[PDB]
């Protein structure tokens, strides 16, 4: 075995920040008849800030090392959004509108 | 076996911050008849800030090490959102609207 | 076996913060007839701040180590949101609206 | 085994930031009859900032190392969004509109 | 085994930033009858800033190393968005419009 | 004398708003040595919203009316802001700065 | 005297707004040695919105009316901002600066 | 005296707005030694919106009317901003600057 | 006296707006030694929008009317901005600059 | 006296806007030693939009009318901006500059 000698003297580190905000946001979605949302995100992201930092230190003298990092993601989801029929709908998500009319007359 | 000698003298570290805010937010979703939300996120994310920091220290002299990091994610979810029929709906999520009418007349 | 000698002298560390706020929030979701929410998030996230810090120290001289880190996630959820029929609905989630009418007349 | 000697003296590091904001956002999506959203993003992204930082230190003298980094993503999702019929819809998501009319008259 | 000797003296590093904003955003998508969105992005991107930083240090004297980095992505998703029929729709997402009319009269 | 006959029938008025915000605001004014603020605004402004409203009704039949509206503003203020001398000042109102020095050496 | 007959029937008025914001604002004014602010605005402005509204109604039959609207503003203010001398000042209102120095050496 | 007959029937007025924002704003004014601001605006402006509105109604039959609208503004302000001397000043309001120096050496 | 007969029937007025923004703004004015600002605007401007609106109605039968509209503005302001001497100034309001130096050496 | 008969039937007016923005703006004015600004604008401008609108209605039968509209503006302002001497100034308002030097050496 050998030596792994780290020496740190007179270090002044400051102001390290990792910031994540409003990721995968769904806003302002009006529906006159219906809103169907299937919300299945998968998040393995990384937001990292490293200042004056070392990683892992592994002193492993020897022959025959096996190091395996593995990530497997399999997707067979089945999503079905179904609506039969829509009629006679007035939807006013805007502002300051006036005199909006939807008329249906059926004579059999 | 060998030596792993870390020496730290006169270190001044400060201001390390990890901040996460409002991730995966669903806001302002009106529905005139119905709102169907299936909310199944999977979150393995990392928000990290490292300042003047070491990782793991493993002094393991020897032959035949097996190190395995594994992550497996399998998805076979079945989601079904169904609505039969929608009619005669007035939806006003906006502001300051006036005289909005939906009329249906059926004569059999 | 060898030596793992850590020496720390005259260290001044300060201001380490990890902050998480309002993650996976569902706000302002009105429904005129119905609101169906299935809320099943899975959260394995990490928000970490490390300042002047070491990890694990393992002094294990020897041959034949097996180190396995494993995470498995399997999803076969079955979600069914169903509504038969919707009619004659007035939904006003907005502000300051006036004279909003929904009329249905059926003559058999 | 050999030597891995890192010496750091008189280091002044500062102002390291990783920032992620509003990724994968869906905003302002009105639908007169219906809104069907299937939201399944997969996120393995990285936002990283590194200042004066080393990686992993592996002192492993020996013959026969096997290092495998593997990531596998398989997608067989089945998504079906279906609507049968839409008629007699007035949708006004704009502002300051007036005298908007939709009329249907059927005489059998 | 040999020597890997890194010496750092009198280093002043500052102002390292990685910033990602509003990626994969869907905004302002109105639909008079229907909006069908299937949102399945796959993100393995990297936004990185490196200042005065080393990578991994691997001191591994020996014959027979096998280092394999592999990423495999297979896509067999099946997406079907279907609508049967649309008629008698007025959609005004613009502002300041007036006297917009859609009339259908059927006499059998 | 005559008649002043006002008749109002079937009136529907709504949504009248007068809003004033953050007028004459002084923000973020740092001074390394001194801050001298003399704050003497004179405000006779009007923010008015009138909907379906009459003014004054004066039925005054006769000869010789004198109606005088008068506003007089006279300003003879005397403002004196005085500082004798400033030296040897370091002012850092900014963020994330480092190694800022102000040195004065006098040898008589 | 005569008649002043106002008749209003079937009136629908709405959405009248007068808005004033952040007028006469002083922001972000740093001074390394001194900040001298004399703040004497005079405001007689009007922000008005009138919808379906009458003014004053004056029924004054007669000869010899005198109507005088007068506004007089006289300004003889005396403002004196004085500083004697400034020296040896470092001012850093910016962000992320480093190694900023101001040196004065006097040898008599 | 005569007649002033106003008749209003079936009036629909809406969306009247008067908006004033950020008038006479002073922003981002750094001074290395000094900032002297004398802030004396005079504001008699008007922001008006009129929809379906009458003015004043004056029924004044007679001979000899005198109507005088007068506005007088007289300005004899005396403003004196004085500084005696400035020397040895470093001002860095910009961002991300480095190694900025101001040196004065006097040898009598 | 005669008749002034105004008749309004079936009027639909909308969308009247008067907007004023950021008038007389002073931004981004750095000074290395000094900033002297004398800010005395005089504002009698008008921003007006008129839709379907009448003015004043004056029924004044008679001989000898005197109508005088008068506005008088007299300016005898005395403004004196004075600085005696400036020397040895470094001003860096720009971004990303480096190695900027100002040196004065006097040997009497 | 006679008749002034205005009749308005079936009027539809809309979309009247008066907009003023960023008038008389002073931006990005750096000074290495000094910035002297005397800011005295006089504003009597008009921004007007008129749609379907009448002016004043004056029914004044008679002989001897005197109508006087008068505006008088007199300017005798006295502005004096004075600086005695400037020397040894480095001003870098640009971005990304390097190695900028100003040197003065006096040997008496």
- Elucidated via: cryo-EM
Whether residue C19 lies within 8 A of chain F, CB to CB, comes out as: no
Partners of I67 in beta bridges: H67, J67
Question: G-chain residues within 8 Å CB-CB of H31?
Answer: 30-32, 35, 91
The separation between the first and the last C-alpha atoms of chain B, rounded to the nearest angstrom, is 95
Q: Over the range C66-89, which residues count as b (16 or more CB within 10 Å of their CB) and which as e?
A: eeeeeeeeebeeebebebeebbeb
Question: H-chain residues within 8 Å CB-CB of I30?
Answer: 28-32, 91, 93
**What is the rounded distance in angstroms from the CA atom of residue A30 to the CA atom of residue D35?**
8
Is the Cβ–Cβ distance between B104 and C104 less than 8 Å? yes
B86-91 and A12-13 as β-strands: parallel, antiparallel, unpaired? Answer: unpaired
Closest CA to E22 of A39, A28, B27, D19: D19
Q: Which residues touch I23 (CB under 8 Å, ≥6 apart)?
A: H23, H24, I43, J20, J21, J22, J23, J24, J25
Q: Over the range E79-106, which residues count as b (16 or more CB within 10 Å of their CB) and which as e?
A: eebebeebebbbbbbebbbbebebeeee
Q: Give the H or E element holding residue H78.
A: strand H78-83
- Residue J42's φ and ψ, nearest 5 degrees, are -120, 125
**What is the rounded distance in angstroms from the CA atom of residue D18 to the CA atom of residue A46?**
10
Closest CA to D87 of D68, D66, D104: D104
Is the Cβ–Cβ distance between G33 and H36 less than 8 Å? no
Ramachandran category for residue E33: left, alpha or beta (phi over 0 → left; psi -120 to 50 → alpha): alpha
Is the Cβ–Cβ distance between B97 and C97 less than 8 Å? yes
**What is the rounded distance in angstroms from the CA atom of residue G3 to the CA atom of residue H5?**
8
Partners of I46 in beta bridges: H46, J46
The separation between the first and the last C-alpha atoms of chain J, rounded to the nearest angstrom, is 95
Partners of J66 in beta bridges: I66
Name the 3-class secondary structure at H99: strand
Q: How many other C-beta atoms are found inside a 10 Å radius of the C-beta of residue F106?
A: 10
Q: Which residues touch F46 (CB under 8 Å, ≥6 apart)?
A: G45, G46, G47, G48
Partners of F102 in beta bridges: G102
Question: B-chain residues within 8 Å CB-CB of D95?
Answer: 94
Which residue, among E22, E33, E64, E67, would best test binding to D if mutated, counting the most D CBs under 10 Å from its CB? E33
**In a 10 Å sphere around its CB, with 0-12 CB exposed, 13-18 middle and 19+ buried, how is residue D96 labelled?**
buried
**In a 10 Å sphere around its CB, with 0-12 CB exposed, 13-18 middle and 19+ buried, how is residue D20 labelled?**
buried
Tell me which residue in C54, C67, C85 faces B84 most closely, judged by beta carbons: C85
Cβ contact I86–J89 (<8 Å) = yes
Cβ contact I90–H91 (<8 Å) = yes
Q: How many other C-beta atoms are found inside a 10 Å radius of the C-beta of residue F56?
A: 9
Residue E87, CA atoms < 13 Å, CB-side half-sphere = 14
Whether residue I12 lies within 8 A of chain D, CB to CB, comes out as: yes
Partners of G55 in beta bridges: none
Question: G-chain residues within 8 Å CB-CB of B99?
Answer: 12
Contacts with I, D 65-104, CB within 8 Å: 96, 98-99
The separation between the first and the last C-alpha atoms of chain H, rounded to the nearest angstrom, is 95
- In chain A, the DSSP E strands lie at 3-9, 12-13, 16-21, 26-27, 34-39, 42-43, 46-51, 57-59, 66-75, 78-83, 86-91, 98-107
**What is the rounded distance in angstroms from the CA atom of residue D33 to the CA atom of residue A91?**
8
Q: Which residues touch G23 (CB under 8 Å, ≥6 apart)?
A: F23, F24, G43, H20, H21, H22, H23, H24, H25
Is the Cβ–Cβ distance between B77 and B40 less than 8 Å? yes
Ramachandran category for residue A64: left, alpha or beta (phi over 0 → left; psi -120 to 50 → alpha): left
**What is the rounded distance in angstroms from the CA atom of residue D94 to the CA atom of residue C12?**
58
Measure in Å the smallest separation between the Cα of F43 and chain H Cα atoms.
Answer: 10
């Amino acid at each position: 075995g050998g030596k792994v000698q780290i020496i740190n003297k007179k270090l002044d580190l400051s102001n390290v920040q990792s910031k994540c905000g409003s990721k995968d946001n769904i806003k302002h979605v009006p529906g006159g008849g219906s809103v169907q949302i299937v919300y299945k995100p998968v998040d393995l992201s990384k937001v990292t800030s490293k200042c004056g930092s070392l990683g892992n230190i592994h002193h492993k003298p020897g022959g025959g090392q096996v190091e395996v990092k593995s990530e497997k993601l399999d997707f067979k989801d089945r999503v079905q959004s179904k609506i039969g029929s829509l009629d006679n709908i007035t939807h006013v998500p805007g502002g300051g509108n006036k005199k909006i009319e939807t008329h249906k007359l059926t004579f059999r």
